[PDB]
Amino acid sequence: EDAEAKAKYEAEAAFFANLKLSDFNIIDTLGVGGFGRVELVQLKSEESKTFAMKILKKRHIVDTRQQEHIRSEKQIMQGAHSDFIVRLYRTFKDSKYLYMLMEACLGGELWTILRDRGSFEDSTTRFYTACVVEAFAYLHSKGIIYRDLKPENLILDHRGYAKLVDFGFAKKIGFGKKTWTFCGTPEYVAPEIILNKGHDISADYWSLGILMYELLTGSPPFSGPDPMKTYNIILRGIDMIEFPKKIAKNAANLIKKLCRDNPSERLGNLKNGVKDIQKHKWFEGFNWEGLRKGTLTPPIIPSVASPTDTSNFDSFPEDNDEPPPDDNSGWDIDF
């Protein structure tokens, strides 16, 4: 359906080029962080159309020296056209804020669902991991590293399909090159990142193993009382970890194959690439075709009554903060 899809995407681009911020009403808050907030917004002329608007304070970006990361986030997410990646339709800007008009996924944050349930069963975790694998296949085929994989970066749509959000640390990297930024909490850093050896797409495969473990247990496999102990545990290796009994044999095999120390040895980096992950015995009987067609039934069916239903999210108080200072540095010229 390539010609149909291209026509649909062109029509979308033309549709969003014409919108202004005054075309939207704020419905409710979907998330609050240090970056800013994510507000559910409703198009005034078509009340069935709602979106997740991420609103970031520009001065806080400058203070944290995240300008390049944010520009990369916009470029990568706005150019990505994947059913397993939250769409970024367009951006806005004024002197104090950046605005990112994203696809609204009202099934809820995977991290809050994981919190409520404690842990996910094997088949549930398998569905979510397959969603991540498809997203990674797309990005890596485009030479993009995601880096920031964790439950907080996955969100469910109204169907229960999981999609990657937050591309703040995503980065395009050349063949035969590496990047050096230490991103993410200490529990999620690959060994090459801990040892300051540089990293590439292979680090994503490490994170995939971590994510499976966390989804199956509620906690990532390497965690100490302090960051240095955490890194020493990571250097000790996935094979030195005492896996809990609930993790199935094949899941443990796949986790160990993704979390190998040598980046060139990790599953997904070998001769058949991501196929080696998809063909792993853990995915025996998993219908990848049905997942990409949307016909596979998700493990958790969200209840969403309408495009303005935010009941799958935690409640958040309205923004009452002092506005940040203006930022006219011009680094946001493309927004």
CB 281 within 8 A of CB 250: yes
Q: How far apart are CA 254 and CA 161, in angstroms?
A: 22
Structural domain boundaries enclosing 103: 14-108+304-333
Element (H, E) at 37: strand 36-43
Element (H, E) at 141: helix 122-141
Same domain, 178 and 52: no
Same domain, 198 and 87: no
Three-state DSSP state, 89: strand
Same domain, 90 and 160: no
CB 88 within 8 A of CB 101: yes
Q: How far apart are CA 185 and CA 227, in angstroms?
A: 9
Q: At what angle do helices 122-141 and 202-217 cross, to 10 degrees?
A: 160
β 171-172/108-109 pair status = unpaired
Element (H, E) at 25: strand 24-32
Q: Which residues contact 34 (CB under 8 A, 6 or more apart)?
A: 60
CATH for 64: 3.30.200.20
Same domain, 308 and 262: no
Same domain, 41 and 70: yes
Q: What resolution, expressed in A, was reported for this entry? A: 2.0
Same domain, 314 and 229: no
What tokens were used for 216? 């199956």
Same domain, 121 and 3: yes
Same domain, 5 and 121: yes
34 annotated among ligand-binding-site residues: yes
Catalytic site positions: 148
Q: Which residues contact 319 (CB under 8 A, 6 or more apart)?
A: 29, 37
Q: Which residues contact 67 (CB under 8 A, 6 or more apart)?
A: 61, 329, 331, 332
Amino acid of residue 316: F
Same domain, 208 and 252: yes
169 annotated among ligand-binding-site residues: no
CA angle 180, 181, 185 (to 5 degrees): 130
Same domain, 55 and 158: no
Closest of 232, 217, 179 to residue 201, by C-alpha: 179
DSSP E strand stretches across 58-200: 88-93, 97-103, 108-109, 144-145, 154-156, 162-164, 171-172
CATH for 124: 1.10.510.10
Q: How far is CA 70 from CA 78, 148, 156, 185, 248, in A?
A: 12, 14, 23, 18, 39
237 annotated among ligand-binding-site residues: no
Same domain, 157 and 258: yes
Same domain, 193 and 243: yes
Output the CA torsion sign for 58, 66, 258, 81: positive
Closest of 321, 313, 214 to residue 258, by C-alpha: 214
β 97-103/108-109 pair status = unpaired
59 annotated among ligand-binding-site residues: no
Integer-rounded Cα radius of gyration of the chain: 20
β 97-103/144-145 pair status = unpaired
What tokens were used for 280? 């792993």
Q: How far apart are CA 282 and CA 26, in angstroms?
A: 43
CA angle 293, 275, 287 (to 5 degrees): 35
How many domains does the structure of the chain reveal?
2
